[PDB]
């Protein structure tokens, strides 16, 4: 990571062109570059880079993810003041405290609609059950009514948590990790549902994210199901939406699992304060989040102040609706393993390749597994970096060139205790040990300078392959 | 502390002998000496020793206290598997819950009663008010109404909470620690309504725990305010008495601070495995139980089975309604200045030294402020031991010496990073920093020891007076 600059990663689909003019003007102001990137991937990637010391200084998700994250150790503690903790609301502070801290800023509050073009439905339908015979008639009209994502299971969840299922059972203000709602009768009359659906051909079983948002804005469709960060293709769309609450399941409210759209700062980024300075006094006020909402929508924000100006739109409160009748998500770790288990189970159900039941019989026990962890950066470890090799004296062409260091704590303390002797000898008087982090395999290097005009000159070093954590005299 | 042996911390107005014969059944079974100790000032004492990596394996103490002994790292995580979780009950879990971990072991529910002599008052007084009034009587006698222990503000709390007194604002789950309830209206006409009942001689400013033991135990006052531990003494007591609800004041009931009586491990000991052992496999059963419940009666337990044989005594009974309408104790840091504040408040207000609320308003800041935090055991720092210096080979008398070690874990990283070089010299290959916990400062010592027979030898070694976090290769 480059201290005196900003690298920040966001999803795709949120509004990253907003966030780097926020990014510009902090850059007038302190003269720091921001750069907005959006991998894919991207709930994956961090982790992965971010274990060995490295990524964005600052990365956006859902709240969800962060649990696990700060369990390893990639997340820095947040250090808001009262004051500015007011300007947000509680609850969503709430979903970024993990055991005790705060290890994220709050940005928006997300949750799933339902999105019709109001030109084909008029009357969207209140019930799921209503979908059927209403993509009857519409096929009828070379339409269809329904598409929605069906490769994320974020997107089926409201329908399979309808009739009862649930991720983690919650009690006591806490999740047991051991009570997994996946293939109760609930879970299993809405995720058969959906396959229902597909076997009656009303929906496409390959269908995902850009498919749906195509053939709505299109006006092939006249429903799908999404967040308020795709209202902004719609309105330029030819289509006259609306945005509603999901339908009911078996009589019951879809209950979409709710996002708080959060900004965490890595432990390794020596940006830190800068990272502080942005969130807090340039993306978290009015205009900040203007500038972001008028690239992609943000749904209901978490500053009061700004989301007071934003509450007079349907869309927002049908996305406030649509949050009450679900449930925020659980930012514990155990829920990347709750979300490969969901996505698996429905895919395959989706597809064919397992039966109902015989897909979620599976994500139960998955669900609950134990997972691999992100392995903790601050452990003993080689870093690679690029640095240009001089000669100290000589004027001379000097190279960039790859190399690495090594870099960490050593787990083990280090003691000194005293040694007895009766030999009038010399002697180191303590007997001690202290763990280092050194180069356990290393190789010969040689580079070839040119210089202005005598001579040529040979520099040598190590390129170091390996670290370990070691004694210090040895 | 030593390996191989258990050292157990717990309160002297608790049963430690009964604790100790559960020490016995241990060593019985396992070879290893439980030793039971009581020293006085130990929720003081603890956190003093514990910080120098030194104390007992295991401390017993309400559960208020823990909070701030895990911040400072003093405490051993726990590691119960389900089944024994299961076996207690999920309230007293949640009381040694801190920042999402489990830092002690629950043992039994603590709440203040009102205890009453049967001979003197057959019916006792259902609210406050009607004190005054009844002291009067009794005092035409020769007893009085009412003695407690005035020093501790865990006997008058219960008094102050009744009209609205709050130690930290509980909302949402949270403590707001700059939310503080100790000048309130409520405080005040609690502390107020003490203060006359000394001033109008019904009670006596000095009156402290042991002074109001004798007094109820000898029969010279009609009641007294205690918790389950007491009342051992009162039936062997010639005194025939009661343990009810306490009095109701301003028509609300009193609410006494909840504790929940904890078990913790110190993180220093070299013995958690035992510890754990111990715990739950000789304290935590019915006869463990059982044990200590014979010397000095712990209420109502954690344990479920043995709550289930106990729930028949109207005293626990009691315990448990006056628990109900009391609030448990918060386990967070702040607690020990909060405790600190009103004991101040109170002794003051009692004894004339300040106004009530003149004694209130500075709790009431002194409640919220920051506190100086017990030093983290993990640092580098110098441990005292004693060992036998002897010679290597030749038979000498080895003498028993006080000796000082370093231990610890510095906190800057380890790294290692090469050096180019032209020099077709030698040279360090790398450039390292490493810091080791060292003798900072340190003085020679020598001793004389007596070989049978030949010859007179002198030992010489180092006495580490300083440790530091140095540079290794320096
Ligand atoms: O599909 C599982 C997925 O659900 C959520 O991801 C959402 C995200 O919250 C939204 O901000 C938006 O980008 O769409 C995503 C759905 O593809 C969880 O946040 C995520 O952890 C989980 O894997
Ligand atoms: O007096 C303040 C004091 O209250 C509580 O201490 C109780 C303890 O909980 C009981 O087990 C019994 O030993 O009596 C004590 C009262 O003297 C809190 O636990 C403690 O932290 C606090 O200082």
């Given at each position: 990571i480059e201290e005196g600059k900003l690298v920040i990663w966001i999803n795709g689909d949120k509004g990253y062109n907003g966030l780097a003019e926020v990014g510009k003007k902090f850059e007038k102001d302190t003269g720091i570059k921001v750069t907005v990137e959006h991998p894919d991937k991207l709930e994956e990637k961090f982790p992965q880079v971010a274990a060995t010391g490295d990524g964005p200084d600052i990365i956006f998700w859902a709240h969800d993810r962060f649990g696990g994250y700060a369990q390893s150790g990639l997340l820095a503690e947040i250090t808001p003041d009262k004051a500015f903790q007011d300007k947000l609301y509680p609850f969503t502070w709430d979903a970024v405290r993990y055991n005790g801290k705060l290890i994220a800023y709050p940005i928006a509050v997300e949750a799933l609609s339902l999105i019709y073009n109001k030109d084909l439905l008029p009357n969207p339908p209140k019930?799921?059950?209503?979908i059927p015979a209403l993509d009857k008639e519409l096929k009828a009209k070379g339409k269809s009514a329904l598409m929605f994502n069906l490769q994320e299971p974020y997107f089926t969840w409201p329908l399979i948590a309808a009739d009862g299922g649930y991720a983690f059972k919650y009690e006591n203000g806490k999740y047991?990790?051991?009570?997994?709602?996946?293939?109760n009768a609930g879970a299993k009359a809405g995720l058969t549902f959906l396959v229902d659906l597909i076997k009656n051909k009303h929906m496409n079983a390959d269908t995902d994210y850009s498919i749906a948002e195509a053939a709505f804005n299109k006006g092939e469709t006249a429903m799908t199901i999404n967040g308020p960060w795709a209202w902004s293709n719609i309105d330029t769309s030819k289509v006259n939406y609306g945005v509603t609450v999901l339908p009911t399941f078996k009589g019951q409210p879809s209950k979409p699992f709710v996002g708080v759209l959060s900004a965490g700062i890595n432990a390794?980024?020596?940006?830190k304060e800068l990272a502080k300075e942005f969130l807090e006094?340039?993306?978290?006020?009015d205009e900040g989040l203007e500038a972001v909402n008028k690239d992609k929508p943000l749904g209901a924000v978490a500053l009061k102040s700004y989301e007071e100006e934003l509450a007079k739109d349907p869309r927002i409160a049908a996305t406030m609706e649509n949050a009450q009748k679900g449930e925020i998500m659980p930012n514990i770790p155990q829920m990347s393993a709750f979300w490969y288990a969901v996505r698996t189970a429905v895919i395959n159900a989706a597809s064919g390749r397992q039966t109902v039941d015989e897909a979620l019989k599976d994500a139960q026990t998955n669900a609950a597994a134990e997972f691999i962890m992100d392995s903790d950066p601050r452990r003993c470890m080689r870093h690679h970096y690029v640095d240009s090799i001089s000669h100290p004296l000589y004027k001379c062409s000097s190279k960039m060139v790859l190399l690495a260091r090594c870099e960490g704590h050593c787990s083990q303390a280090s003691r000194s205790e005293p040694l007895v002797s009766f030999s009038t000898v010399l002697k180191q008087p303590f007997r001690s040990s202290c763990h280092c982090c050194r180069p356990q395999t290393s190789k010969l290097k040689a580079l070839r300078l040119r210089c202005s005009g005598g001579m040529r000159l040979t520099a040598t070093y190590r390129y170091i392959l390996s670290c370990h954590c070691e004694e210090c005299n040895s």
């Open positions: 019930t799921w059950e209503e047991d990790i051991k009570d997994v709602g996946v293939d390794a980024s020596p940006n006094n340039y993306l978290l006020t």
